[PDB]
C-alpha cells in the first residue's frame, strides 16, 4: 500500500488517511 496525494491510482481503494512528515495523505491499497 501507499500514501498518496491527491488520490489513489487506478486499481486501488482508499482506507483512511496517513499522517506522514507533517502532511495528510490518502492511504491507498
Residues in contact with a second copy by the rule CB under 8 A = 1-3, 15-21, 25, 27
Query: Is 19 one of the binding residues for Cl ion (CB under 5 A)?
Result: no
C-alpha radius of gyration, the chain, whole number: 8
- Name the grid cell of 19: 499522517
Give the residue, chosen from 13, 19, 23, 25, that forms a contact with Cl ion under the rule CB under 5 A.
Answer: 23
Separation between Cα atoms, residue 4 and residue 12, nearest integer Å: 11
**Residues present in the chain in total:** 29
**Partner whose binding site includes residue 26, from Cl ion, a second copy, none (CB under 5 to 8 Å by kind):** none
Binding site for Cl ion (CB under 5 A): 1, 23
Amino acid at each position: 500500500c501507499y500514501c498518496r496525494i491527491p488520490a489513489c491510482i487506478a486499481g486501488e481503494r482508499r482506507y483512511x488517511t496517513c499522517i506522514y512528515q507533517g502532511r495528510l495523505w490518502a492511504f491507498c491499497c
